[PDB]
């Protein structure tokens, strides 16, 4: 069992899933409305969104309080966030600007990937070695979508039997997608293209928000019960409360290097020869050059205007 990193509005916490009865440790305190959270393990970085400050920040683990603002403008409700630990990128969703965007880890070179046909985008998850990103939208037409990490080839993968898809996560070892629906009261799983869908957990989910996974176990936060719960990812059996009496549990991850599998960065040492952004791509050579928003990529496919 892993450490679980979770956002908690006024702070970010870490609880040992193996001992959820003890006090959680406060990794970062003095926050206003911390919602989304992720990390880059090899870099010793933890990122979070704050929906009242309208910002994304980061710190260095156990070398705090060296906290920095990384995205400060053009955000209103940054409800979801994911770190590309391979391409070294930051992705996020905003349910009020209706946008999915990407930037470097330091916030530079920001690029709007999608800004249309988004209503209530929420959770976002990345498969950097496959060049895909996945997100949920709990709006008027609820759905789960995926697209290239370079913003290519957007497609809807789930759009039936869905209402409030709040949590989303990936199993890198088994190539499976998992999500939590807070209105329909279940957790489901499917192939990464959404096919071969199956029920996992079918009750006791009054208000799941965020979902993660480690080894044979799913972990999630529930807004109603103010706790973290777990079950078996194959059978949905062994439903149990891991950690209780949480002030306001939010986004959550299994905090482990093993949850960010190593691979070769297709961008290589020289940023793939891109002048600005080198983004993971699902198509060979598995990276794609890109430019900050508004600026056009030239004919050579590598240099921005």
């Amino acid at each position, epitope marked *: 069992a892993p450490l679980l990193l979770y956002a908690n509005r006024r702070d970010l916490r870490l609880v040992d899933a193996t001992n959820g009865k003890e006090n959680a440790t406060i990794v970062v305190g003095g926050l206003e409305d911390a919602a989304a959270v992720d990390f880059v393990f090899s870099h010793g970085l933890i990122y979070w969104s704050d*929906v009242s400050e309208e910002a994304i920040k980061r710190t260095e683990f156990n070398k705090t309080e060296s906290v920095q603002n990384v995205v400060v403008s053009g955000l209103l409700s940054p409800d979801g966030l994911a770190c590309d630990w391979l391409g070294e990128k930051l992705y996020w969703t905003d349910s009020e600007t209706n946008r999915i965007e990407v930037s470097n880890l330091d916030g530079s070179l920001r690029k709007v990937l999608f800004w249309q046909e988004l209503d209530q985008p929420r959770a976002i998850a990345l498969d950097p070695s496959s060049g895909f990103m996945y997100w949920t939208d709990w709006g008027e037409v609820p759905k789960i979508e995926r697209a290239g990490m370079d913003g290519s080839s957007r497609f809807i993968i789930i759009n039936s039997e869905i209402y409030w898809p709040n949590g989303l996560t990936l199993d890198y070892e088994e190539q499976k997608l998992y999500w939590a629906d807070a209105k329909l009261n279940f957790i489901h799983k499917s192939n990464l293209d959404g096919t071969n869908r199956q029920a996992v957990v079918k009750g006791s989910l009054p208000h799941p928000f965020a979902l993660t996974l480690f080894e044979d176990i799913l972990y999630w936060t529930d807004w109603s019960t103010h706790s973290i719960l777990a079950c078996n990812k194959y059978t949905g059996e062994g439903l149990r409360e891991i950690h209780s009496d949480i002030f306001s549990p939010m986004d959550i991850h299994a905090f482990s290097q093993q949850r960010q599998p190593n691979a070769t960065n297709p961008c290589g040492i020289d940023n793939g020869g891109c002048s600005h952004l080198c983004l993971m791509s699902p198509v060979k050579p598995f990276y794609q050059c890109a430019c900050p928003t508004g600026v056009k990529l030239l004919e050579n496919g590598k240099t921005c205007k």
Partner: antibody
Amino acid sequence: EVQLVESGGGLVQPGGSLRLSCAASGFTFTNSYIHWVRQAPGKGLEWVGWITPYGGYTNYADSVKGRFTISADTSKNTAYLQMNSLRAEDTAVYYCARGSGHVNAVKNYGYVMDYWGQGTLVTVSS
Amino acid sequence: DIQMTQSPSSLSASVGDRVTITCRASQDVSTAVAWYQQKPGKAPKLLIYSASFLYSGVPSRFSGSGSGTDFTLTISSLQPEDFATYYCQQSYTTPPTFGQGTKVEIKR
């Protein structure tokens, strides 16, 4: 426009029960918190509890926990306050009020009460 | 429970006067504070939430400020129709709790 209409208030003997209703219209019932708040004659406002009709989850004030419960019939867009073992001190005007914003939103205004019913008077007396 | 303490519990001021009502929380509730106006025999009406956000349709003379534990309601220019009891409330966590209220009378 948003509307909340309370009914069922009345004279009731101590130790008795009474069910109040809150009929809602003009907004999506299942997207909201619905609160009950009471005010004794000449006194302040006291939150009694809330329900989120989508699944029927509730929270209650310590003062009424064990005696009062809240339920909702989404087919009728109506919430109910079931009051048991009534005491003289329960005498008050009971309001139902809607929380602001969407129950599923991250920026949560669910405890900000933006629309209130007219209230219904409950008198616990012999 | 978070105790919300208003002061003063009542006041009288003249039309055109600037009036200040304070609300103090026993814990840090960030900016999760709302203000309501209650006229006699009527339900409370929301004036302000998130400490400083003026609710649609509410007169500009009403404003709220504050953060953490100390919050203020200001009426910049008191009007005769402002006779009421005003309540602060934390919307920060369960249970929602209200201040004891401040009765405002018009001095003429």
